[PDB]
Design a protein around this ligand. Structure first.
Ligand SMILES: O=C1O[C@H](CO)[C@H](O)[C@H](O)[C@H]1O
Ligand SMILES: [Mg+2]
Ligand code: NA
Ligand code: NA
Lengths: 210, 211
């Protein structure tokens, strides 16, 4: 048995003065997650590009918790639909970063990607990154994963660029609001909103204000 | 460069002066044909250097100009730098080649409009408000020529002034121009009348465009 005591007002309320209905409760999902003792505790995915975006490097930093052992490995594999386009395998032990050494509980994988299909609102090309924590000899301990969008966002000479091209933001602010369920969101409502937005020539959304 | 007394009078009466080199090559095709030519650098140099040597002590002169309507040639860049080295006390401007070249400290277009772009190839005349904020642009904007006062004219003059007052980096401009270039001729009865191009049997000529 779980018991959860939810306070409507807290010191947190001073930082939550959004122009919206003031409600309270357990209003998003509750889940139970099982992870192994030796586990992926964090991963970051970055994509960097050459000048014309014909070459990319995917860089995945992976952190673990548990006891560190020589046989442990991370394999990051990148997939374009059903095709594995790149893969890399390494033991833990990051590069030296200071006088005390480096992170023995982290590893960074770097994968080369030629002619990456680029992500934008116009063409949302996605790859799948799979992060496998495993023994060298082939025992999968656990896997985590994400969708990867190959895109560069930068401000250069006063312009916001996406893959080297200046954006024109056709945007809207969107609160999480339902007339029957209040601030509880569901997949159907989210999809309905995205459809209507894109059908009405929006390409951007601001998460007002959370 | 004007008659020497002009500068004395502007010193004493109080007017800001743009002192401009006697270099205009408008009729060349393209406009920079002579000004990009190193053979013409000596002649151009003298028209710039000898002006600065003459007029540098006048407080009324606040800006040096490299001339007018001669495109943008490497000779302009060389002479822009000469002035900056010899006289750091005054900005240098020049409009040729699109009003915002490397040979000018001030965005100094001629007849750029307030709100309307005129996107001519190579040498566009942007809306003055738009011009200030083009990616990477930081310079002040003062039109070397604007509000062409030919005959019944100066329509839209207030639009420039509203913009000048609203935009810090829009620091005004110079109207074109002060006085009609008409000349006195006399009829059969010795009565004087105002003449323009073509009235002296001069041909080809551009008629009333001098007024
Ligand atoms: O300034 C704002 O204008 C909106 C007016 O409805 C709303 O209050 C937004 O949350 C706030 O950022
Ligand atoms: Mg508010
Ligand atoms: Na101003
Ligand atoms: Na004229």
């Amino acid at each position: 048995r779980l018991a959860v005591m939810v306070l409507r007002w807290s010191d947190g309320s001073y930082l939550e003065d959004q122009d919206m209905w003031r409600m309270s409760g357990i209003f998003r999902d509750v889940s139970l997650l099982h992870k192994p003792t030796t586990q992926i505790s964090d991963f970051h995915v970055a994509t960097r590009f050459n000048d014309d975006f014909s070459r990319a490097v995917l860089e995945a930093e992976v952190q673990m918790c548990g006891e560190l052992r020589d046989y442990l490995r991370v394999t990051v594999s990148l997939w374009q639909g059903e095709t594995q386009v790149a893969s890399g395998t390494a033991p833990f032990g990051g590069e030296i970063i200071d006088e005390r050494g480096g992170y023995a509980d982290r590893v960074t994988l770097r994968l080369n990607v030629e002619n990456p299909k680029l992500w934008s609102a116009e063409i949302p090309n996605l790859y799948r990154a799979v992060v496998e924590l495993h023994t060298a000899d082939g025992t999968l301990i656990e896997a985590e994963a994400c969708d990867v969008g190959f895109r560069e966002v930068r401000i250069e000479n006063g312009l916001l660029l996406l893959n080297g091209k200046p954006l024109l933001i056709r945007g809207v602010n969107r609160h999480e609001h339902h007339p029957l369920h209040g601030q509880v969101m569901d997949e159907q409502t989210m999809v309905q909103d995205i459809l209507l937005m894109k059908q009405n020539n929006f390409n951007a959304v601001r998460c007002s204000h959370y | 460069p004007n008659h020497p007394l002009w500068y004395t009078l502007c010193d004493r009466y109080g007017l800001y002066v743009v002192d401009e080199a006697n270099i205009e090559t408008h009729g060349m095709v393209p406009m920079n044909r002579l000004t990009d030519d190193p053979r013409w650098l000596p002649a151009m140099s003298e028209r710039v250097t000898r002006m600065v040597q003459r007029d540098r002590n006048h407080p009324s002169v606040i800006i040096w100009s490299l001339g007018n309507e001669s495109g943008h040639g490497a000779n302009h860049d060389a002479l822009y730098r000469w002035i900056k080295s010899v006289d750091p006390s005054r900005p240098v401007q020049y409009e040729g080649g699109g009003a915002d070249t490397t040979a000018t400290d001030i965005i100094c277009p001629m007849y750029a409009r307030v709100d309307e772009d005129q996107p001519f190839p190579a040498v566009p005349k942007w809306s003055i408000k738009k011009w200030l904020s083009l990616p990477g642009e930081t310079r002040p904007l003062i039109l070397c020529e604007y509000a062409h006062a030919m005959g019944n004219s100066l329509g839209g003059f207030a639009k420039y002034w509203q913009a000048f007052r609203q935009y810090p980096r829009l620091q005004g401009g110079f109207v074109w121009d002060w006085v009609d270039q008409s000349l006195i001729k006399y009829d059969e009865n010795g009565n004087p009348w105002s003449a323009y191009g073509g009235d002296f049997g001069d041909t080809p000529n551009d008629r009333q465009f001098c007024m």
